[PDB]
Amino acid sequence: KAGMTTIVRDLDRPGSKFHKREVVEAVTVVDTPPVVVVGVVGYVETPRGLRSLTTVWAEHLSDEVKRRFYKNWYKSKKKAFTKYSAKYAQDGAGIERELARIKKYASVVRVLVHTQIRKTPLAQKKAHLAEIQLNGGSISEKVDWAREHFEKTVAVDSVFEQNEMIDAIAVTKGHGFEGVTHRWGTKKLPRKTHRGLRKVACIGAWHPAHVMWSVARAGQRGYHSRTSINHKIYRVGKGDDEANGATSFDRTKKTITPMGGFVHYGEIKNDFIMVKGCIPGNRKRIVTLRKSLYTNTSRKALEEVSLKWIDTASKFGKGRFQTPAEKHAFMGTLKKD
Amino acid sequence: FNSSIGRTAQGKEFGVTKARWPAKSVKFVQGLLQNAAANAEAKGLDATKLYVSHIQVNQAPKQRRRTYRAHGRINKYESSPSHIELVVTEKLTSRQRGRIAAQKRIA
Amino acid sequence: DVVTREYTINLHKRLHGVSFKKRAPRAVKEIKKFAKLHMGTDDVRLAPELNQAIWKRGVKGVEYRLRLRISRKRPLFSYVEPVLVASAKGLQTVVVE
RNA sequence: GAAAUUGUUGAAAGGGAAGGGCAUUUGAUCAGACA
RNA sequence: UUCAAAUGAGAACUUUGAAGACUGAAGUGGGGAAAGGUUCCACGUCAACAGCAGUUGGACGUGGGUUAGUCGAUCCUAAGA
RNA sequence: GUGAACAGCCUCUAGUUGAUAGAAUAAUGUAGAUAAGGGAAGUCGGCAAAAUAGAUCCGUAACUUCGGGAUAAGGAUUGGCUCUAAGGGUCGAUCAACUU
RNA sequence: UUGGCGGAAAGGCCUUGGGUGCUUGCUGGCGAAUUGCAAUGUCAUUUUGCGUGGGGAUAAAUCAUUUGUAUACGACUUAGAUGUACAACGGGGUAUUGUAAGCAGUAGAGUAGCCUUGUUGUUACGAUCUGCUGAGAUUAAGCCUUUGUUGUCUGAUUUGU
């Protein structure tokens, strides 16, 4: 997640007062460089639930993924996957043997992918590794697809498209220990209250002689897992395309990055996804975008969205200019130049 | 004696969460370790083999002061002294017999 | 080894949001921490002339920038002195022969 | 130089108390007849 | 409150210098009545006391110090005894 | 010095710099504060808080023991700078005050 | 040893070939005692340790330091042994305020002084105004960026089927 901005578009909604009229909406931008496939995993149905049977890794792994396996990378000998790579040094009978096992027994196939964290302006340098399920085709086709994509990159435009409802999964911003008044939204006690007023006056009756689980108590606020659904994609952005922040109406040559860069994040030099509304999590946090679990047809979806204007003024203050050229034209020459 | 004390990451070496840095008690122990090593050298023991084979702390008689409380009351205000000592050192029935006899001549 | 260099320390960002009664004493400890980072010496000694420069405008009137001369001498310790300049702006690290 | 209470060493047990009664297993320890 | 030096086995707290501050003349200044009784001053010294510390102290040990014809008491009488 | 002022605020002389410290800045507190639109709907009750505030000029009701009520209520003005007028002492001259 | 099958916790089942042992399917020949008239009369499989020799493999974690997407303390998330490395400064961008100091002016309500009484007399005092000047200052402390400058990069502890 990089940050938020504003867009202007026409509303296509018959029967509404603002039909065929411009509306102003907030959007969230997610920086999405291509992910790299580095393995596959097969799952077997069991009376006790799904069980992973075998994992097969790619022959070569970059230092980004290898950093995930270390806590003290700078002191390590970097021996990870050194003996496993020897399985490819032969004809490949060992690798082919495990792939046949996945084809024969597995009923669910997932691929191990990792982000290219070096392409972001972040300082982490350690990539995030995750499993993504493959849908479509038979079990053999899924394994063959995973095998051919080892050490390759998959772009975001091959997964999502325009005007598609997606779900965002992330961890919310943390706030530490919080009192009941803001953690749960209980009423503040009168000003006359002795011993403090940001509390719950009665936490339980005499019987049962215990505090119940359903009573509001002070504790940790934030940093929770959340799954927010039904977010429409407004734009699938291209990293190498100049005029990312341009529309068919604005026609100015400008990228999606606002003047001065995204606050606390930086510049967007990769592909991005523009999502209507707000998304759980703060800036610089890793997020997972997932396709919807059902076919939505409430006419809020299926609507074709065409952006007219994208705000690129500075978010570090009351920004007034979209581009440096606009500032120079309005102000003229300065003593600095 | 660790009730309601803080916890630190430096306790993971000894598999605990609660640990502290009692500087004053450390200095008293250091002085006695120095004295014991000097005594060992005077006797003629090998310093490289010395290990602490005995160390023991006992309660000394308390030293008493007074503290003043609300509504004109007086409570005690006492110290807990210690006694410290340490030592360093250089590092068949007849039926059973018949069965045994039978087995000897059987193999 | 023994070396003398001149530094510019940004005290504005190091005293951001500090209680007014503690800003000048905090600047003393920040300078000692600053000398530890660059010279790697546990012992840091501040000249009384530098102490006057820090407290020039009261307990809460510390300058935004200070020009410091740091000398590492003989196991080793760092000695910090002020440098008399019109302004501390636009100066980078230089080595003093 | 007793008890409450405490340190060290040794042995033993411990899934929201501990202690007790009857019986036996296991470990440790011990008197009595060799007429 | 801060920097440095001196002393010391040991210094956030002792001494000196420098800096930053406060009381702001109905004072955190300069004297007294009552009450206390050597707490005054010098040297030596840190077990206990100064609810942290201590080389410092109204602490501990040993000594020194209060000079009137004119300042008070003394004399007079008050309510009263 | 400011000002009506032994008010509050700052300084000179003189005297102190003494009250366990270091690090961090969660909840809940104690103390000090600010809030869009509404304006007592809160509460036993405007509790608490807010508003008003010096001075000069204008203006001031019922009632009344004629003394009051009264700062009733209700309005206006206030910096800095450069000037002007008036208000004195001693013997035409000469010298010296902040008041409007 | 050959081949096949079994993934629900497969760790098992079936099969090919030869070697070697036994065979009570049938007929023989030797041995047993004394544990004294019974005494479980000791024939199982659990785990671990120390010594033999026959192969096999040559790492990490924690503390300390650092980061703020985290945080009462622990915990969490990052970085650091030669580099699209990290840090401290500097430069640029982005922001906030609203035109710095200094110098100059035939700007400026007016009032004084001098000789030379000057058809802007000069010289002093004078809130303020104008020009240089959308200037100057501040800008990550939880903003972005960097072919510049100067540095930094082997301390401690513990873990084995």
Ligand SMILES: [Cl-]
């Ligand atoms: Cl009492």
Ligand SMILES: [Cl-]
């Ligand atoms: Cl609070």
Ligand SMILES: [Cl-]
């Ligand atoms: Cl932390």
Ligand SMILES: [Mg+2]
């Ligand atoms: Mg809410």
Ligand SMILES: [Mg+2]
């Ligand atoms: Mg009350």
Ligand SMILES: [Mg+2]
């Ligand atoms: Mg913003």
Ligand SMILES: [Mg+2]
């Ligand atoms: Mg407890």
Ligand SMILES: [Mg+2]
């Ligand atoms: Mg507590």
Ligand SMILES: [Mg+2]
């Ligand atoms: Mg008390």
Ligand SMILES: [Mg+2]
């Ligand atoms: Mg009392």
Ligand SMILES: [Mg+2]
């Ligand atoms: Mg005795």
Ligand SMILES: [Mg+2]
């Ligand atoms: Mg006892």
Ligand SMILES: [Mg+2]
């Ligand atoms: Mg005051």
Ligand SMILES: [Mg+2]
């Ligand atoms: Mg003052």
Ligand SMILES: [Mg+2]
């Ligand atoms: Mg004295």
Ligand SMILES: [Mg+2]
């Ligand atoms: Mg004490």
